[PDB]
Design an enzyme around this catalytic site. Structure first.
Site, short mmCIF file in Angstrom:
data_model
loop_
_atom_site.label_atom_id
_atom_site.label_comp_id
_atom_site.label_asym_id
_atom_site.label_seq_id
_atom_site.Cartn_x
_atom_site.Cartn_y
_atom_site.Cartn_z
N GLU A 1 -5.33 11.81 -1.02
CA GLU A 1 -4.34 12.88 -1.03
C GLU A 1 -3.39 12.81 0.15
O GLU A 1 -2.18 12.96 0.00
CB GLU A 1 -5.01 14.26 -1.04
CG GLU A 1 -5.75 14.59 -2.32
CD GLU A 1 -4.83 14.96 -3.47
OE1 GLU A 1 -3.60 14.97 -3.29
OE2 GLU A 1 -5.36 15.24 -4.57
N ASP B 1 -6.63 7.22 -13.67
CA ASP B 1 -5.19 7.09 -13.85
C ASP B 1 -4.35 6.20 -12.94
O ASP B 1 -3.79 5.18 -13.40
CB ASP B 1 -4.52 8.49 -13.88
CG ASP B 1 -4.87 9.36 -12.68
OD1 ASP B 1 -4.50 10.56 -12.71
OD2 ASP B 1 -5.50 8.88 -11.71
N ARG C 1 0.61 12.08 -0.56
CA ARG C 1 1.48 13.22 -0.30
C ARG C 1 2.16 13.18 1.07
O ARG C 1 3.40 13.21 1.15
CB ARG C 1 0.65 14.50 -0.51
CG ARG C 1 0.04 14.51 -1.92
CD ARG C 1 -1.09 15.50 -2.19
NE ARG C 1 -0.57 16.80 -2.57
CZ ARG C 1 -1.16 17.67 -3.40
NH1 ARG C 1 -2.32 17.41 -3.99
NH2 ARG C 1 -0.57 18.83 -3.60
N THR D 1 2.97 7.77 -6.39
CA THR D 1 2.39 8.67 -7.37
C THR D 1 2.70 10.15 -7.17
O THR D 1 2.39 10.97 -8.04
CB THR D 1 0.87 8.42 -7.46
OG1 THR D 1 0.40 8.83 -8.75
CG2 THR D 1 0.15 9.17 -6.36
N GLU E 1 3.44 15.24 -14.80
CA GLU E 1 3.31 14.06 -15.64
C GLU E 1 4.14 13.91 -16.91
O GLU E 1 4.53 12.80 -17.25
CB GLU E 1 1.84 13.79 -15.95
CG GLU E 1 1.04 13.44 -14.70
CD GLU E 1 0.76 14.67 -13.85
OE1 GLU E 1 0.50 14.51 -12.64
OE2 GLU E 1 0.80 15.78 -14.40
O1 LIG Z 1 -0.46 16.46 -11.43
C1 LIG Z 1 -0.16 16.23 -10.06
C2 LIG Z 1 -0.91 15.91 -8.74
N1 LIG Z 1 -2.12 15.01 -9.07
C3 LIG Z 1 -1.91 13.67 -9.63
C4 LIG Z 1 -1.22 12.85 -8.48
O2 LIG Z 1 -0.98 11.51 -8.87
C5 LIG Z 1 0.17 13.55 -8.14
O3 LIG Z 1 1.03 13.42 -9.27
C6 LIG Z 1 -0.08 15.07 -7.70
O4 LIG Z 1 -0.94 14.94 -6.56
CA LIG Z 2 1.09 10.80 -10.31
#
Ligand SMILES: OC[C@H]1NC[C@@H](O)[C@@H](O)[C@@H]1O
Ligand SMILES: [Ca+2]
Ligand SMILES: *[C@@H]1O[C@H](CO)[C@@H](O[C@H]2O[C@H](CO)[C@@H](O[C@@H]3O[C@H](CO[C@H]4O[C@H](CO[C@H]5O[C@H](CO)[C@@H](O)[C@H](O)[C@@H]5O)[C@@H](O)[C@H](O[C@H]5O[C@H](CO)[C@@H](O)[C@H](O)[C@@H]5O)[C@@H]4O)[C@@H](O)[C@H](O[C@H]4O[C@H](CO)[C@@H](O)[C@H](O)[C@@H]4O)[C@@H]3O)[C@H](O)[C@H]2NC(C)=O)[C@H](O)[C@H]1NC(C)=O
Ligand SMILES: *[C@@H]1O[C@H](CO)[C@@H](O[C@@H]2O[C@H](CO)[C@@H](O[C@@H]3O[C@H](CO[C@H]4O[C@H](CO)[C@@H](O)[C@H](O)[C@@H]4O)[C@@H](O)[C@H](O[C@H]4O[C@H](CO)[C@@H](O)[C@H](O)[C@@H]4O)[C@@H]3O)[C@H](O)[C@H]2NC(C)=O)[C@H](O)[C@H]1NC(C)=O
Ligand SMILES: *[C@@H]1O[C@H](CO)[C@@H](O)[C@H](O)[C@H]1NC(C)=O
Length: 510
Positions: A99, A242, A103, A486, A396
């Site tokens: 995370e 994923d 982020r 991501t 998503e």
């Molecule tokens: O749905 C969103 C949340 N979790 C999945 C991660 O890849 C990112 O898109 C965000 O932290």
């Molecule tokens: Ca993502």
């Protein structure tokens, strides 16, 4: 009107931002309903969870805003000064490596990139912060012999700590979704160590598990870090699985390292072979789960998280090119493109067939074997379990819609995006009739009408959901020059020659 929906999305973002800035400025967690907030670390020091994650969205909107350009500029300044003067990652607290990397590290890196290419703010502030955080996170790779990191690390001491549950195994996606971030950092600093440490995790993963041969490139969601071996677990493209697939392709798009494309190809063919199926009665394509190995039954349950696959598949087939030009290239995969359209449609239907026009956290597609207290979609293609009715402002689907629109230019995607943007506006708003107090929050229940609100705003509502919706209505966006991490933090495609001169190459093979 593109510019109009643009004004609307910018407005929605600013309403959330104004409220957050007024009541929870500087805090990691914020609840819009009660205007409450707190920081994640036990010591109450901030991580910049919301601010850092949102800086690049502020920059993108500032770059194209016609009504609030001045406000966006001031907020970038506010955010930048706070990041430079207040934020301090020398915190005696354990944080999740994954995370914090996607982020915070990612957000600082993209803020540097956009600051650089858009010429707004002081890029140095972000890069310096990224180097320091990157060093704190990098210590996680020194814990095991395999190079696979434990789930968490103390930002001040550098002490690593294994996953509390799951027999101590790490989540597969968690250590395979750190590569774009550390490789871009290596590229900017010339420090090969970041690159070497993050690429190291793949060899044991593939070799020790006979991943290609035995699993057809499909990964169980848990992997023991000390042995590098998979733990008995579910194989799914949902949480914990994923982004492993996501970063195989994105590394290729970012660094041009073909090995990752080859690995990506293997996993996609495996996915089509073992996880793909169609619902009834609309024959919507979906990716299911295998809870008991590839030899077990196929579960029609699908996390909303899987919806990013539309954009990934489309991106991998076109490499960012308009289909017009992509369709004539040797690397174009007709199969991947057709499936991309298919999965994006399915995910759109998860909103369209929803009573609120918003897709819940998890759905269960109808495979003709749904024979209790589950909610049935408008058409009946999927059901929603009582406990999965919440909506956490996830990105998503709008993520995939954005990619599909810019790669296909099919206006149908902007129409879909508009509908979803409106559903978020109408079904997640608080003080909906007062633009001065209006704000947006998560839902504990998005199936009941009126929807039931939860007191929490996810940082990704700002970093991703609103960002992808915004980009969707940008008339020009070159997907061949950027790769999104991501958390929707855009990094530039790296120059192969510079990578070569810096000795940044694939340090392993298979
Ligand atoms: O749905 C969103 C949340 N979790 C999945 C991660 O890849 C990112 O898109 C965000 O932290
Ligand atoms: Ca993502
Ligand atoms: C943040 O916002 C910025 C904008 O504020 C945005 O940057 C770019 O946005 C557009 C991206 O599509 C881009 O416009 C396109 O430009 C195409 C290229 O031709 C034009 O730009 C050339 C390069 O410009 C740079 O260099 C110039 C010096 O050489 C410099 O002055 C300029 O500031 C840039 O740094 C330029 O050389 C070209 O010049 C020719 O044409 C001039 C007339 O326009 C003429 O005076 C010159 O003598 C010369 O003949 C030219 O200006 C262009 O092909 C493309 O056209 C297409 O777009 C239209 C849109 O209406 C469609 O109808 C159709 O698709 C058409 O083919 C389009 O105009 C901007 O030029 C960029 N802005 C700047 C200042 O960089 C950025 O992307 C955004 N970032 C994000 C992520 O949000
Ligand atoms: C490229 O990028 C990489 C990745 O970030 C950088 O590598 C890091 O480099 C730093 C400094 O060279 C390393 O940190 C140092 O590690 C030393 C060795 O650690 C051992 O001893 C400690 C005991 O304190 C044990 O906990 C640990 O398990 C090891 O057994 C430490 O002795 C150093 O401590 C000193 O500095 C700190 C700074 O705050 C003081 O607090 C201490 O009191 C002491 O004075 C220091 O911590 C770090 O381990 C490297 N990370 C990784 C993942 O390799 C590169 O520096 C950078 N540039 C280069 C050279 O390529
Ligand atoms: C940009 O930020 C760096 C680091 O904070 C600082 O050293 C530099 O002076 C700043 N540039 C200016 C003068 O705006």
């Amino acid at each position: 009107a593109g510019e109009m929906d643009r004004d609307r999305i910018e407005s929605m973002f600013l309403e959330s931002w104004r409220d957050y800035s007024k009541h929870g400025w500087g805090y990691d967690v914020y609840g819009p309903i009660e205007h409450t907030s707190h920081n994640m670390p036990r010591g109450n020091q901030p991580l910049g969870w919301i601010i850092v994650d949102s800086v690049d969205t502020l920059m993108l909107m500032y770059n194209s805003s016609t009504l609030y350009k001045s406000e966006f500029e001031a907020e970038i300044q506010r955010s930048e000064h706070w990041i430079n003067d207040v934020l301090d990652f020398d915190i005696d607290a354990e944080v999740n490596v994954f995370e914090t990397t996607i982020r915070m590290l990612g957000g600082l890196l993209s803020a540097y990139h956009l600051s650089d290419v858009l010429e707004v703010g002081n890029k140095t502030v972000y890069l310096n912060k990224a180097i320091d955080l990157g060093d704190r996170l990098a210590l996680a790779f020194l814990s095991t012999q395999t190079g696979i990191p434990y789930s968490s690390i103390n930002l001040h001491s550098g002490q690593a700590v294994k996953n509390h549950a799951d027999g101590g195994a790490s989540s597969t996606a968690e250590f395979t979704t750190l590569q774009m971030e550390f490789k871009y950092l290596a590229y900017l600093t010339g420090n090969r160590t970041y690159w070497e440490l993050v690429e190291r995790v793949y060899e044991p993963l593939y070799k020790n598990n006979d991943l290609l041969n035995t699993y057809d490139g499909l990964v169980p969601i848990y992997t023991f870090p000390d042995t590098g071996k998979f733990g008995a677990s579910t194989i799914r493209f949902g949480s914990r699985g994923d982004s492993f697939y996501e970063y195989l392709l994105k590394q290729y798009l970012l660094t041009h390292e073909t090995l990752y494309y080859d690995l990506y190809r293997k996993s996609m063919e495996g996915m089509k072979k073992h996880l793909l199926a169609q619902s009834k009665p609309s024959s919507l394509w979906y990716i299911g789960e295998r809870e008991q190995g590839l030899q077990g039954q196929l579960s029609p349950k699908m996390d909303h998280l899987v919806c990013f696959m539309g954009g990934l598949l489309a991106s991998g087939s076109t490499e960012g090119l308009s289909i017009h030009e992509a369709r004539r290239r040797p690397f174009f995969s007709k199969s991947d493109w057709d499936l991309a359209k298919g999965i994006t449609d399915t995910c759109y239907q998860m909103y369209k067939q929803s009573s609120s026009g918003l897709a819940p956290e998890i759905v269960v597609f109808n495979d003709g074997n749904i024979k209790d207290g589950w909610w049935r979609s408008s058409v009946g293609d999927f059901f929603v379990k009582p406990l999965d009715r919440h909506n956490l402002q996830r990105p998503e689907t709008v993520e995939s819609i954005m990619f599909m629109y810019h790669l296909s230019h099919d206006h149908k995607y902007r129409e879909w995006g508009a509908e979803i943007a409106t559903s978020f506006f109408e079904n997640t708003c608080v003080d909906c009739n007062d633009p001065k107090l209006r704000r947006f929050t998560s839902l504990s229940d998005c199936i009941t009408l009126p929807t039931k609100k939860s007191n929490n705003m996810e940082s990704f509502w700002l970093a991703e959901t609103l960002k992808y919706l915004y980009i969707l209505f940008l008339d020009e966006f070159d997907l061949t020059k950027v790769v999104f991490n991501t958390e929707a933090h855009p990094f530039p495609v790296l120059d192969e020659e510079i990578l070569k001169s810096q000795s940044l190459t694939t340090g392993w093979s298979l």
